[PDB]
RNA sequence: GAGGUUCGAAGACGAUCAGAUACCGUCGUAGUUCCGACCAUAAACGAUGCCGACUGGCGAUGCGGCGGCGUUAUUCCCAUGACCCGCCGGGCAGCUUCCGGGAAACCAAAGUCUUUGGGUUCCGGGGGGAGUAUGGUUGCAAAGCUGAAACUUAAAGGAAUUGACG
């Protein structure tokens, strides 16, 4: 059972906000993993990437503590990456999913060239880069599938990108920032400023502002 | 040396006083067994040790009020101080000490008000590197 | 994003800063959207409606926002001729 | 050190000049 | 930086030419040495006569005798 | 020194629009500048620019909008033979769905789409998208 | 790993600049480098001030001062506790605080 | 910052700009039509002089030259206003 | 805000501004504030344009008023000169106050006693109380401030250019905001002055 | 070639040390000093090629100019000159910041780089072997410059982390 402490939390559980597009729109911090659990019930299948044991050194032996990465996505728009370090593998994983859940974003997908059917690839050639490593996502005509290393494939397959050729380099071994560079790749699809956008925004109220009556609850 | 106080005492002590300022006094053995009433202090050492600050904070209070403290009179006292005010704080009677340039600001406004303006002295500036 | 059948794809259309026309992040938390009221015209009194008004993070952390609030506000007839 | 091996070789080569030039 | 110009097709070619005698993997292949040095004269395998059997001692971390042939 | 007066200018009008600058002037000016900026005007990539006529070279002052992500310049003007035009617009523009390689052919300065309608090649200048 | 942006040195805009040999180790150092105390010690010191002010033939009398420009190489500056050895944030804070 | 109407710069903030940096390059110099006490004759002296400006008459000497503007001699007037 | 007619600057108001010295800025000048100044005198003290000073003041009003629920406006002061002030507009409007320590992520944290997801900050000095501004980067928090000439404008919706130095002047601003925010909508005529004096708004030093 | 103030490789003794052909001492040659030829290298270091464009603050200062508001002086003013307050060019520099960079340390620039090309010079391609051998050349010579391979080798290294020992 909930006890949503955040207002954005409260609004979610009373069928008040209709689709999380209404959150992303206003750039609001999700801070309760259960929110995304309302709003993508089922779907949202969660793949561990790696369990790499870090370990810090001390007067007696080495503190060893695990780092789990988890990827999350619904093969349809939304994906996330969660990195949690803990003393134990099951704690890490369980509590990384909780972050991945939080830090999911939508990916804008576009179109090869002929403007027909449904969106199978990335709009532009976005890049994303995490400390050395960098990953470029090139648009892709249908049927091609994903054309990358395992790890970005496992994040892109999740995003509901169907097709993409990539170009990556740095120290691609270092999985964390194989995956975190190609987090910021697929974040920056929706940051790509194309003509297709280019219309002045109509603008709308806000969840806090429309439903300010229900937050001062009755 | 032997005895500086522990935070089980420092916290409980401060919290009794916050809640029973009127009940306590500046003796030991009185407020000593007030603490037996208003609390469930298990050990005699602690029971007794607590009336430690219960006194050391009354000896402070009469002399002065703590910068951070729990009290009922002080909060009541603070409200009274706030209410008192001059009839007009900013009225400044008639005649403000105004720079000629400040007079210039008014002119752009186009407002007209009483005031003599004085500018004097060399442009010394501020500070001596 | 239409296609053959004028078909509006893309699960949302983002907001877009008023000051830079630059598209405002999904997780750009230093965003704003300032709502500013108008008056009756005669007496005073917010009664009526609303000058909504957004700004990105980058412009905030640059230090501007208020330069770029004014200029918009005084275009929109809220502020006037200082 | 660096300085005292560059100075080793610039003494040692000078011995191969001397050794060589005999023949 | 790089030379970048439009009638610079040589300064470029001749740049990317010599800055291969600093590659290691080509200075095997294109110099001479290799063909001259490897008993296998550029040849995949080769035949030879066993002149004695010699045990070789493996490199420290792994102790053992390796059992080879002088050919 | 000033070798190429585009690269000069286009750096400074990419390099404002990052900062969100409302408008910028471009110091040297040229015909080629004007003629390639007026291309950017049509697809929206900038607003109206107003060229000063200092008696010597020219200055321009470009109204920017938010819309230009980058404009750049291919510095040597390679000769584009129409079969290559694709291979370029593959590896020099973010998608096949927008992005404009401004170049300079037989029939004036223009984007790559307009050289393709007229079926001409010619010399690449730059690209905005 | 440039420790001091400056290089503990205070050159900038030059080249070889006068070397000066220390007042302890006799060790050679640049002028811009090197710690430069300048002591204005009283001659008589704290104790004798009043022995000497009795025995003075003259009346009142200010007494002089030695104006020595001490002038240490960094080695002796650290060994003999003129400066010390600070934290990474602290290394920067160039004020001189009594 | 984010809105400087470069094309219509207020008159003050070109005079605090180096001559060539301005919106249009103009000079920061001038000629002055100079009296001097003896003769009534007026010479057309250029502020930034370089040379010594002698009187059309003879004896007197108008302008010692210095770094920037010219040093007028002792008691003589001038007239900017033109163009 | 740009008071085209009715909500103009008036005369009784101006004399307050002069009396307290709210136009007498600091010696130095953060450039973001060269829109809101006319001269420096000699000595080297900058002079704020009481006209812009006000327009802005209303601009904050328009924005606070905008807030449907008046008790989701955080009102901060860390420096003491506002301490009293903020409590008193907060009581006047029915907004929510923070005097003393901007406490650890009252904007972030779903566990600390204090969080608050307020929809607008108001601050005495951006210079001093400069956490909440920065926490207001992690939530989508607009932000009114009571800037000086020497004040950075990282993270401010809107800057009200003032003194925010001599307690005397500070209060005034916390008044006029309070005043306007109740004139706009609330419960004041426009024609008549307040029951409420300034004297209530600008702190007292140890005095009696 | 001139000269021999000190200091001082080398060099001589005294100590110290298990030893010190080292440091710590006491002597003192070449040289450090001059004038005339060569040599042509530094951690010759901002470990940042040169020219050119663009992008933020804020303080200071050297020079020049410009403007202003000061006055000490300096005289009846002056001219000055000396301080004050500004602006302007180009100099040496400082701080500060989520520009933007940057593996990192850091960097108004190392910024404008998968959003890849303003011009151009040099130059690196795992570590050693090796700056060696050999060849050529310059040099009176130390040496300078040009400059390989077989062989061996898995890391050597850089930036930051905890350790832990000084
Ligand atoms: Mg013989
Ligand atoms: Mg040097
Ligand atoms: Mg000699
Ligand atoms: Mg000795
Ligand atoms: Mg060298
Ligand atoms: Mg570099
Ligand atoms: Mg490149
Ligand atoms: Mg090698």
């Amino acid at each position: 059972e909930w006890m949503p402490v955040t207002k954005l939390g409260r609004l979610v559980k009373d069928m008040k906000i209709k689709s999380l597009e209404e959150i992303y729109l206003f750039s609001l911090p999700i801070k309760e993993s259960e929110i995304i659990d309302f709003f993508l019930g089922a779907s949202l299948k969660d793949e561990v990437l790696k369990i790499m044991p870090v370990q810090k050194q001390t007067r007696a032996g080495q503190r060893t503590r695990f780092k789990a990465f988890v990827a999350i996505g619904d093969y349809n728009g939304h994906v996330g990456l969660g990195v949690k370090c803990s003393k134990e593998v099951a704690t890490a994983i369980r509590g990384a999913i909780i972050l991945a859940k939080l830090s999911i974003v939508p990916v804008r997908r576009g179109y090869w060239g002929n403007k027909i059917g449904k969106p199978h690839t990335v709009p532009c050639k976005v890049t994303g880069r995490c400390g050395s490593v960098l990953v470029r996502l090139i648009p892709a005509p249908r049927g091609t599938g994903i054309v990358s290393a395992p790890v970005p494939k496992k994040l892109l397959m999740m995003a509901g990108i169907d097709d993409c050729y990539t170009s990556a380099r740095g120290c691609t071994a270092t999985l964390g920032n194989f995956a975190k560079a190609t987090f910021d790749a697929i974040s920056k699809t929706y940051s790509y400023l194309t003509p297709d956008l280019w219309k002045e925004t109509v603008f709308t109220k806000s969840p806090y502002q429309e439903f300010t009556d229900h937050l001062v609850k009755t | 040396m032997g005895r500086v106080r522990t935070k089980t005492v420092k916290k409980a002590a401060r919290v009794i006083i916050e809640k029973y300022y009127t009940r306590l006094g500046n003796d030991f053995h009185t407020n000593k067994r007030v603490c037996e009433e208003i609390a469930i202090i298990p050990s005699k050492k602690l029971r007794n040790k607590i009336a430690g600050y219960v006194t050391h904070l009354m000896k402070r209070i009469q002399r002065g009020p703590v910068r951070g403290i729990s009290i009922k009179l002080q909060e009541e006292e603070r409200e009274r101080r706030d209410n008192y005010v001059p009839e007009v704080s900013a009225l400044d009677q008639e005649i403000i000490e105004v720079d000629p340039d400040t007079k210039e600001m008014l002119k752009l406004l186009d407002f007209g008000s009483l005031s003599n303006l004085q500018v004097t002295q060399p442009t010394v500036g501020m500070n001596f590197k | 994003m239409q296609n053959d059948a004028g078909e509006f794809v893309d699960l949302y259309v983002p907001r877009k800063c008023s000051a830079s026309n630059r598209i405002i992040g999904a997780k750009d938390h230093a965003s704003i959207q300032m709502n500013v009221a108008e008056v009756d015209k005669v007496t005073g009194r917010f009664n009526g409606q609303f000058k909504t008004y957004a700004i990105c993070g980058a412009i905030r952390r640059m230090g501007e926002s208020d330069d770029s609030i004014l200029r918009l506000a005084k275009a929109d007839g809220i502020v006037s001729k200082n | 050190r660096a300085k005292w091996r560059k100075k080793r070789m610039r003494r040692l080569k000078r011995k191969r000049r001397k050794m060589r030039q005999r023949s | 930086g790089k030379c970048r110009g439009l009638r610079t097709a040589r300064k470029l070619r001749s740049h990317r030419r010599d800055h291969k005698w600093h590659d290691k993997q080509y200075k095997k292949a294109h110099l001479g040495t290799a063909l001259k040095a490897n008993p296998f004269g550029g040849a995949s395998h080769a035949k030879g006569i066993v002149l004695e059997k010699v045990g070789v001692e493996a490199k420290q971390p792994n102790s053992a005798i390796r059992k080879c042939v002088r050919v | 020194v000033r070798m190429n007066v585009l690269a000069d200018a286009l750096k400074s009008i990419n390099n404002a629009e990052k900062r969100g600058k409302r408008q910028v002037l471009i110091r040297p000016c040229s015909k080629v500048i004007v003629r390639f900026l007026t291309v950017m005007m049509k697809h929206g990539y900038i607003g109206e620019f107003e060229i000063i006529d200092d008696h010597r070279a020219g200055k321009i002052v470009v109204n920017l909008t938010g819309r230009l992500n980058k404009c750049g310049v291919i510095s040597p003007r390679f000769d584009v033979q129409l079969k290559d035009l694709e291979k370029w617009q593959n590896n020099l523009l973010p998608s096949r769905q927008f992005g404009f390689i401004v170049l300079t052919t037989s029939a004036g300065i223009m984007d790559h789409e307009e050289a393709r309608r007229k079926h001409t090649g010619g010399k690449i200048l730059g690209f905005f998208f | 790993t440039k420790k001091r942006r400056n290089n503990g040195r205070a050159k900038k805009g030059r080249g070889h600049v006068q070397p000066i040999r220390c007042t302890n180790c006799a060790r050679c150092v640049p002028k811009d480098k090197a710690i430069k105390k300048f002591v204005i010690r009283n001659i008589v010191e704290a104790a004798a001030v009043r022995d000497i002010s009795e025995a003075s033939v003259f009346d009142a009398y200010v007494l002089p001062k030695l104006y020595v420009k001490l002038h240490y190489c960094v080695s002796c500056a650290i060994h003999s506790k003129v400066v010390r050895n600070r934290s990474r944030e602290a290394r920067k804070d160039r004020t001189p605080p009594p | 910052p984010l809105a400087k109407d470069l094309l219509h710069p207020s008159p003050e903030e070109e005079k605090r700009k180096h001559k060539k940096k301005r919106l249009v390059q103009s000079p920061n110099s001038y000629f002055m039509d100079v009296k001097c006490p003896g003769c009534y004759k007026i010479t057309t002296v250029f502020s930034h002089a370089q040379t010594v400006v002698l009187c059309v008459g003879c004896s007197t000497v108008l302008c010692q030259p210095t770094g920037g503007k010219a040093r007028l001699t002792e008691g003589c007037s001038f007239r900017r206003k033109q163009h | 805000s740009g008071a085209l007619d009715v909500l103009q600057m008036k005369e009784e108001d101006v004399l307050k501004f002069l009396a307290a010295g709210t136009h007498l800025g600091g010696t130095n000048l953060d450039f973001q504030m060269e829109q809101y100044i006319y001269k420096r005198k000699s000595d080297g003290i900058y002079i704020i344009n009481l006209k812009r000073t006000w327009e802005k003041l209303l601009l904050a009003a328009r924005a606070i008023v905008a807030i449907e629920n008046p008790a989701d406006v955080s009102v901060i002061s860390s420096r003491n000169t506002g301490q009293r002030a903020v409590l008193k507009f907060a009581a006047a409007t029915g907004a929510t106050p923070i005097a003393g320590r901007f406490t650890p992520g009252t904007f972030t944290n779903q566990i600390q006693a204090a969080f608050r997801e307020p929809r607008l900050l108001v601050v005495t000095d951006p210079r001093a109380d400069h956490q909440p501004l920065t926490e207001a980067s992690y939530v989508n928090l607009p932000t009114i401030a009571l800037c000086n000439t020497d004040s950075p404008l990282r993270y401010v919706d809107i800057a009200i250019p003032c003194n925010n130095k001599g307690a005397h002047s500070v209060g005034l601003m916390w008044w006029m905001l309070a005043r306007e925010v109740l004139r706009m909508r609330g419960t004041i005529s426009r024609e008549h002055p307040w029951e409420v004096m300034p004297d209530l708004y600008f702190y007292r030093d140890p005095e009696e």
Side-chain angles (χ1 to χ4, degrees):
Chain A
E1 206 84 302
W2 235 299
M3 215 84 273
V5 305
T6 58
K7 87 186 27 170
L8 195 273
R10 272 197 233 48
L11 295 171
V12 173
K13 68 97 93 295
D14 17 316
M15 278 77 169
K16 215 52 55 183
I17 301 173
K18 209 165 278 155
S19 54
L20 33 47
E21 282 34 278
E22 306 265 21
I23 294 162
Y24 293 108
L25 190 57
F26 306 91
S27 320
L28 300 153
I30 292 172
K31 292 196 186 171
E32 282 177 19
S33 175
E34 301 88 283
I35 284 175
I36 190 48
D37 196 307
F38 213 117
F39 228 5
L40 295 173
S43 329
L44 205 67
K45 298 162 65 276
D46 267 80
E47 219 60 46
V48 175
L49 290 172
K50 178 186 208 70
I51 309 308
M52 65 110 158
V54 302
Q55 31 177 63
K56 75 111 167 186
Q57 180 51 171
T58 178
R59 97 177 53 265
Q62 57 275 135
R63 204 96 265 83
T64 189
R65 36 200 314 237
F66 289 168
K67 186 147 183 179
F69 299 95
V70 169
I72 173 158
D74 62 309
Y75 301 152
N76 192 165
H78 320 108
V79 261
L81 188 286
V83 199
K84 178 82 273 209
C85 138
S86 201
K87 287 167 189 167
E88 140 183 2
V89 65
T91 297
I93 282 170
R94 188 280 229 119
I97 292 159
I98 220 160
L99 297 176
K101 288 266 193 71
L102 258 49
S103 186
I104 60 144
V105 300
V107 310
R108 173 172 163 65
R109 40 276 248 288
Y111 254 25
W112 192 74
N114 198 272
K115 222 179 180 70
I116 167 171
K118 301 208 96 299
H120 44 73
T121 189
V122 189
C124 312
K125 27 225 189 151
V126 298
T127 178
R129 48 181 296 184
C130 179
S132 90
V133 166
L134 96 81
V135 196
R136 196 178 153 160
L137 299 186
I138 320 309
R142 287 211 268 357
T144 44
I146 291 81
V147 179
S148 327
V151 167
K153 189 156 182 176
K154 217 71 182 275
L155 279 150
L156 297 173
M157 292 253 64
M158 282 190 215
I161 301 310
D162 250 339
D163 335 324
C164 185
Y165 343 112
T166 66
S167 176
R169 53 67 123 253
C171 191
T172 310
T174 53
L175 170 65
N177 48 316
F178 213 77
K180 279 162 72 186
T182 188
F183 213 85
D184 345 327
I186 62 199
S187 313
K188 293 172 73 184
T189 61
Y190 248 122
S191 296
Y192 225 80
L193 211 176
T194 74
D196 182 53
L197 283 336
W198 263 41
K199 295 159 63 61
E200 54 262 46
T201 54
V202 172
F203 268 158
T204 329
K205 287 194 149 75
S206 171
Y208 293 9
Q209 189 267 28
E210 168 87 334
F211 304 82
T212 191
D213 303 333
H214 235 338
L215 293 170
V216 61
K217 70 222 76 149
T218 60
Chain B
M1 237 248 293
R3 250 151 147 81
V4 167
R5 277 73 129 190
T6 22
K7 74 202 161 295
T8 58
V9 181
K10 308 255 217 191
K11 286 179 192 152
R14 198 208 35 247
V15 167
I16 292 158
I17 302 170
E18 151 45 9
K19 275 176 275 183
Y20 299 98
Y21 186 84
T22 55
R23 293 230 160 294
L24 306 165
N26 190 46
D27 282 316
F28 199 146
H29 325 295
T30 58
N31 27 281
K32 197 173 76 164
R33 246 153 318 82
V34 171
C35 304
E36 268 309 324
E37 249 298 40
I38 62 105
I40 305 168
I41 304 165
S43 42
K44 185 152 195 149
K45 195 186 281 283
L46 195 67
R47 173 216 84 92
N48 190 58
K49 173 71 236 102
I50 270 174
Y53 294 126
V54 169
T55 59
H56 226 6
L57 293 175
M58 300 346 191
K59 298 253 178 67
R60 293 182 54 185
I61 297 191
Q62 195 59 344
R63 206 169 193 270
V66 180
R67 181 177 181 170
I69 193 175
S70 52
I71 300 180
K72 268 298 180 297
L73 286 177
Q74 291 193 353
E75 291 185 357
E76 303 158 331
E77 192 287 339
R78 291 303 175 177
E79 170 284 345
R80 297 170 54 90
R81 301 182 66 266
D82 294 13
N83 176 196
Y84 160 103
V85 183
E87 322 71 23
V88 180
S89 185
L91 58 73
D92 185 9
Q93 63 274 2
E94 301 174 358
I95 297 168
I96 311 176
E97 295 261 299
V98 177
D99 315 5
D101 308 357
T102 33
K103 173 63 177 180
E104 301 308 357
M105 247 279 188
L106 308 186
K107 286 190 174 180
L108 177 63
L109 296 176
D110 191 10
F111 287 79
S113 303
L114 305 183
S115 53
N116 328 1
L117 301 178
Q118 284 288 162
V119 305
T120 299
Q121 305 303 165
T123 58
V124 178
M126 288 303 178
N127 96 61
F128 199 107
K129 305 191 195 72
Chain C
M1 345 49 195
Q2 316 112 94
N3 59 29
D4 151 64
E7 184 86 359
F8 285 96
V9 195
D10 220 355
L11 35 68
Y12 74 87
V13 178
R15 284 170 320 101
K16 185 146 61 175
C17 172
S18 215
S20 62
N21 223 112
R22 197 160 58 198
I23 63 181
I24 215 157
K27 289 189 190 285
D28 178 57
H29 292 311
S31 302
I32 278 178
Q33 147 175 264
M34 260 277 288
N35 262 315
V36 192
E38 311 101 28
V39 264
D40 80 333
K41 198 74 184 295
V42 181
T43 62
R45 306 270 265 89
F46 150 40
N47 196 172
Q49 28 172 218
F50 241 3
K51 244 69 178 75
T52 184
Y53 245 7
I55 320 177
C56 70
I59 292 160
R60 287 191 83 165
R61 80 191 43 86
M62 181 154 36
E64 297 320 327
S65 43
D66 86 316
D67 233 43
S68 47
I69 276 283
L70 268 197
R71 291 169 334 116
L72 299 164
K74 77 196 201 62
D76 255 23
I78 303 301
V79 182
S80 62
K81 270 53 59 51
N82 339 106
Chain D
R1 202 202 240 207
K3 203 164 199 175
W4 317 139
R5 181 157 30 75
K6 205 202 300 164
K7 212 232 226 303
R8 170 85 101 266
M9 275 266 287
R10 289 186 293 153
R11 266 167 205 162
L12 185 275
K13 289 168 70 161
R14 187 250 287 281
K15 270 214 302 297
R16 297 159 177 198
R17 269 135 234 273
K18 193 77 170 282
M19 263 265 173
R20 174 105 144 209
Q21 184 262 5
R22 268 225 276 201
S23 308
Chain E
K2 303 174 63 270
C3 77
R4 207 37 102 324
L6 192 274
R7 301 146 98 211
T8 339
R10 150 197 301 181
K11 157 65 77 171
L12 288 174
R13 180 206 276 119
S14 57
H15 202 279
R16 224 79 296 276
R17 184 143 91 218
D18 330 28
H19 299 287
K20 302 205 194 105
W21 321 100
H22 303 284
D23 200 328
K24 200 186 181 171
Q25 283 70 61
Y26 189 99
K27 213 175 181 178
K28 285 263 193 294
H30 289 227
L31 215 194
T33 76
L35 285 166
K36 212 267 185 66
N38 322 317
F40 280 37
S44 44
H45 335 199
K47 280 190 76 173
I49 313 147
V50 175
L51 62 86
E52 73 211 352
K53 290 179 281 177
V54 182
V56 167
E57 213 57 69
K59 291 193 279 164
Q60 192 311 285
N62 297 268
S63 76
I65 306 157
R66 253 60 256 250
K67 316 209 176 297
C68 323
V69 169
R70 292 243 76 193
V71 178
Chain F
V1 285
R2 329 204 70 68
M3 299 307 187
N4 196 56
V5 193
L6 282 188
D8 258 337
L10 290 178
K11 222 83 276 207
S12 76
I13 84 173
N14 148 69
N15 201 13
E17 269 246 39
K18 290 173 167 171
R19 267 215 159 289
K21 216 65 66 183
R22 205 85 192 294
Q23 118 225 158
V24 281
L25 68 72
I26 52 186
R27 210 222 106 246
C29 187
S30 159
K31 185 186 298 170
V32 186
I33 286 175
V34 165
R35 295 261 44 178
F36 141 54
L37 290 174
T38 49
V39 168
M40 267 195 301
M41 194 166 286
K42 307 311 195 204
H43 329 294
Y45 278 72
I46 55 174
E48 38 258 50
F49 67 90
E50 320 165 15
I51 89 192
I52 301 147
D53 181 91
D54 44 66
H55 176 327
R56 327 109 211 341
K59 282 168 209 208
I60 300 188
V61 193
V62 189
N63 288 178
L64 284 172
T65 68
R67 323 207 201 196
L68 183 56
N69 325 54
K70 163 176 181 150
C71 58
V73 45
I74 301 324
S75 199
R77 301 203 238 285
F78 313 119
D79 347 3
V80 182
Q81 185 149 185
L82 206 98
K83 301 158 288 100
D84 333 32
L85 192 57
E86 164 89 47
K87 291 194 292 160
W88 272 138
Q89 91 206 30
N90 169 78
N91 80 302
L92 185 45
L93 297 178
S95 58
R96 288 210 66 252
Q97 296 265 235
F98 53 79
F100 278 68
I101 292 166
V102 70
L103 50 67
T104 157
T105 83
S106 50
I109 306 192
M110 57 232 226
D111 67 331
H112 84 216
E113 227 107 339
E114 198 188 359
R116 192 89 133 246
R117 218 156 313 85
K118 297 176 168 174
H119 152 39
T120 68
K123 320 210 96 150
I124 192 174
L125 301 180
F127 66 113
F128 52 77
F129 63 95
Chain G
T1 88
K2 272 187 95 175
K3 193 169 275 210
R4 282 164 284 296
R5 187 235 182 81
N6 180 28
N7 330 317
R9 202 65 214 285
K11 190 174 88 281
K12 316 233 156 169
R14 305 179 269 238
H16 152 62
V17 286
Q18 275 165 357
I20 285 144
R21 298 223 346 285
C22 156
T23 54
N24 218 30
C25 35
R27 168 160 185 12
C28 208
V29 207
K31 186 160 194 181
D32 60 76
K33 198 151 175 175
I35 292 77
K36 309 179 305 310
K37 274 195 299 189
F38 175 110
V39 192
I40 76 259
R41 209 203 300 264
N42 220 358
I43 275 59
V44 305
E45 304 228 332
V49 68
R50 60 92 255 211
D51 245 36
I52 288 162
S53 74
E54 285 177 340
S56 72
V57 179
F58 289 113
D59 205 14
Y61 216 48
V62 70
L63 309 166
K65 282 192 171 63
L66 287 146
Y67 309 131
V68 188
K69 184 137 195 291
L70 287 179
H71 199 340
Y72 296 8
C73 59
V74 185
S75 67
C76 312
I78 296 169
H79 161 60
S80 77
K81 307 175 193 196
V82 176
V83 304
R84 297 208 290 132
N85 125 74
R86 323 144 87 140
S87 32
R88 188 167 318 111
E89 308 134 347
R91 269 190 308 289
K92 298 186 170 193
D93 322 341
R94 151 211 250 66
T95 60
Chain H
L2 283 284
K4 279 159 58 58
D5 68 329
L6 293 167
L7 297 134
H8 308 264
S10 79
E12 65 182 310
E13 30 77 341
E14 308 305 81
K15 313 236 162 288
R16 63 127 60 200
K17 287 187 79 178
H18 184 282
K19 65 225 279 261
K20 316 275 287 201
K21 313 262 201 154
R22 288 131 151 215
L23 195 66
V24 182
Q25 172 210 303
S26 85
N28 195 332
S29 89
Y30 68 58
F31 297 40
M32 16 186 268
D33 276 68
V34 175
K35 294 248 67 167
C36 102
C39 302
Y40 80 91
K41 269 69 181 202
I42 318 177
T43 47
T44 324
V45 176
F46 168 14
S47 73
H48 302 311
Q50 328 218 305
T51 53
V52 288
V53 186
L54 291 162
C55 196
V56 190
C58 265
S59 57
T60 195
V61 44
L62 286 74
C63 270
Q64 274 328 308
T66 66
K69 289 185 189 177
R71 211 314 103 95
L72 288 163
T73 41
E74 197 115 51
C76 320
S77 17
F78 56 94
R79 270 272 144 63
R80 310 272 289 101
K81 181 54 63 177
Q82 219 254 35
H83 234 249
Chain I
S1 281
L4 301 116
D5 31 316
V6 160
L7 26 71
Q8 236 240 305
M9 183 133 203
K10 308 291 244 63
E11 282 289 89
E12 78 196 2
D13 297 37
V14 166
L15 292 167
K16 291 169 169 58
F17 278 72
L18 293 128
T22 54
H23 79 244
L24 251 64
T27 301
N28 274 46
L29 173 64
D30 182 38
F31 92 49
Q32 297 285 309
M33 308 299 282
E34 283 182 0
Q35 222 57 96
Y36 309 75
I37 278 155
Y38 120 34
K39 279 286 163 194
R40 71 210 144 289
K41 301 179 279 193
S42 76
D43 0 316
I45 303 290
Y46 275 66
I47 316 168
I48 303 189
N49 310 305
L50 293 152
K51 197 137 64 43
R52 232 98 60 278
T53 307
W54 189 330
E55 268 105 81
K56 278 289 177 114
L57 219 178
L58 288 153
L59 232 169
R62 319 218 85 75
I64 295 162
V65 169
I67 301 267
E68 194 166 295
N69 215 117
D72 1 8
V73 173
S74 250
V75 190
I76 311 170
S77 186
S78 84
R79 293 176 65 278
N80 20 302
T81 58
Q83 224 95 59
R84 176 157 187 206
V86 299
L87 266 307
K88 265 59 199 294
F89 117 49
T93 310
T96 347
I98 346 187
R101 250 319 235 59
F102 179 71
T103 298
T106 80
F107 300 124
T108 45
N109 295 309
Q110 334 87 267
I111 305 294
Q112 282 212 13
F115 79 27
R116 320 141 104 350
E117 295 138 60
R119 256 169 31 161
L120 187 90
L121 290 193
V122 198
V123 174
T124 53
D125 294 34
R127 204 88 184 291
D129 338 356
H130 111 43
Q131 284 273 158
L133 299 202
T134 33
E135 275 58 54
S137 81
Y138 299 72
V139 216
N140 323 152
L141 253 160
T143 297
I144 317 306
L146 268 288
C147 302
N148 219 53
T149 63
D150 242 339
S151 275
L153 309 194
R154 265 251 178 77
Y155 304 86
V156 278
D157 152 291
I158 208 86
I160 310 182
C162 316
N163 239 343
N164 71 351
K165 198 78 175 194
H168 222 164
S169 40
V170 166
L172 260 197
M173 304 310 312
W174 291 97
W175 200 352
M176 293 259 174
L177 242 182
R179 201 234 299 259
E180 237 56 274
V181 299
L182 286 155
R183 269 182 164 153
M184 320 244 315
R185 152 271 338 276
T187 170
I188 315 169
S189 315
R190 294 275 182 180
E191 302 146 58
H192 265 318
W194 240 333
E195 222 144 40
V196 175
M197 204 146 58
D199 255 342
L200 208 74
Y201 271 85
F202 45 119
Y203 84 32
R204 322 179 77 143
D205 231 27
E207 247 63 39
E208 197 187 23

